[PDB]
Design an enzyme around this catalytic site. Structure first.
Site, PDB file in Angstrom:
ATOM      1  N   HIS B 167     -23.787-102.461  33.901  1.00  0.00           N
ATOM      2  CA  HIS B 167     -23.763-101.741  32.640  1.00  0.00           C
ATOM      3  C   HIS B 167     -25.122-101.844  31.963  1.00  0.00           C
ATOM      4  O   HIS B 167     -25.952-102.676  32.328  1.00  0.00           O
ATOM      5  CB  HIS B 167     -22.661-102.342  31.749  1.00  0.00           C
ATOM      6  CG  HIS B 167     -22.350-101.537  30.525  1.00  0.00           C
ATOM      7  ND1 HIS B 167     -22.155-100.172  30.558  1.00  0.00           N
ATOM      8  CD2 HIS B 167     -22.160-101.912  29.236  1.00  0.00           C
ATOM      9  CE1 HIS B 167     -21.860 -99.741  29.344  1.00  0.00           C
ATOM     10  NE2 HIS B 167     -21.856-100.777  28.523  1.00  0.00           N
ATOM     11  N   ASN B 187     -23.564-100.126  21.982  1.00  0.00           N
ATOM     12  CA  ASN B 187     -22.803 -99.896  23.193  1.00  0.00           C
ATOM     13  C   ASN B 187     -22.314 -98.454  23.175  1.00  0.00           C
ATOM     14  O   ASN B 187     -22.551 -97.727  22.210  1.00  0.00           O
ATOM     15  CB  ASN B 187     -21.638-100.883  23.266  1.00  0.00           C
ATOM     16  CG  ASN B 187     -20.946-100.868  24.610  1.00  0.00           C
ATOM     17  OD1 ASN B 187     -21.557-100.570  25.634  1.00  0.00           O
ATOM     18  ND2 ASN B 187     -19.664-101.206  24.616  1.00  0.00           N
TER      19      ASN B 187
END
Ligand SMILES: *[C@@H]1O[C@H](CO)[C@@H](O[C@@H]2O[C@H](CO)[C@@H](O)[C@H](O)[C@H]2NC(C)=O)[C@H](O[C@@H]2O[C@@H](C)[C@@H](O)[C@@H](O)[C@@H]2O)[C@H]1NC(C)=O
Lengths: 5, 227
Positions: B167, B187
């Site tokens: 990620h 995020n």
């Protein structure tokens, strides 16, 4: 492989 | 250099987005970085297309996974990136329609910093902080605890060497709370996740690679300020 929500 | 700094307060950061069931954190960190660098350089904040990256960055693997730096390279090479509006997100691999895009935000170049064992944690922290002050940067990270996170400063929890690169997040600033230093990371799992879509990652924890390996691979777009 990549994280998902 | 400030004790604390946050680009998400300076109007150079788009709203938190939702990547859905697609492993595209890499693309969201890249679009996120480009949006900021462009707003800082030119004064206009516009949302950019993660989908064009997912469909067009042939070196990456779309919704499976990909890379921030490869995204930046692609943008340099293809004259820029389409806006979120002109090339909507579908959360699934699709045909590259870059040739059909008429408008694009351009970048001048891009940087990459791959930490080596010759550097010390202090130096990794020092340079990263330096890059962030200039503009938000994208970093690879092991998001194994993300589904569990809800607030406060994340210290690495269940992460452990070797850290997986599954990620990417967007470092937009840093701050403190009771003597605990943290990075402010944007995020892409919706605004309801974490702290309004952001996660505070503890810094200076001692490991050269940082929390969940976030010190390992940084990359950011480079844009010379507009005259
Ligand atoms: C490290 O892994 C632990 C187990 O896989 C996490 O705890 C688990 O958290 C789940 C969702 O928060 C919960 O449904 C499970 O019951 C729980 N497992 C156990 C046995 O406690 C742990 O998450 C942190 O600690 C738990 C206790 C909760 O307080 C979570 O809110 C915390 O995030 C993981 N560490 C992390 C994510 O920091």
């Amino acid at each position: 492989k990549a994280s998902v929500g | 250099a400030p004790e604390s700094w946050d680009w998400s307060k300076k109007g150079v950061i788009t709203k938190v987005k939702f990547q859905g069931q697609c492993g595209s954190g890499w693309a969201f960190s890249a679009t996120g970085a480009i949006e900021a660098a462009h707003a800082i350089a030119t004064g206009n904040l516009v949302s950019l297309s993660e989908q064009e990256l997912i469909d067009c960055v042939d070196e990456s693997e779309g919704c499976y996974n990909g890379w921030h730096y490869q995204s930046f390279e692609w943008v340099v090479k293809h004259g820029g990136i389409a806006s979120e509006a002109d090339y909507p997100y579908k959360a699934r691999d699709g045909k590259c329609k870059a040739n059909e895009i008429q408008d694009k935000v351009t970048i001048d170049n891009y940087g990459v910093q791959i930490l080596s064992n010759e550097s010390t944690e202090s130096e990794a922290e020092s340079s990263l902080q330096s890059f962030v002050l200039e503009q938000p940067i994208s970093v690879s990270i092991d998001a194994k605890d993300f589904h569990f996170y809800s607030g406060g400063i994340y210290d690495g929890g269940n992460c452990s060497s070797p850290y997986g690169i599954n990620h990417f997040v967007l470092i937009v600033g840093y701050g403190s709370e009771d003597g605990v230093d943290y990075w402010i990371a944007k995020n892409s799992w919706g605004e309801d996740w974490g702290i309004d879509g952001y996660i505070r990652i503890q810094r200076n924890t001692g490991n050269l690679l940082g929390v969940c390996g976030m010190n390992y691979f940084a990359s950011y777009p480079i844009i010379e300020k507009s005259e």
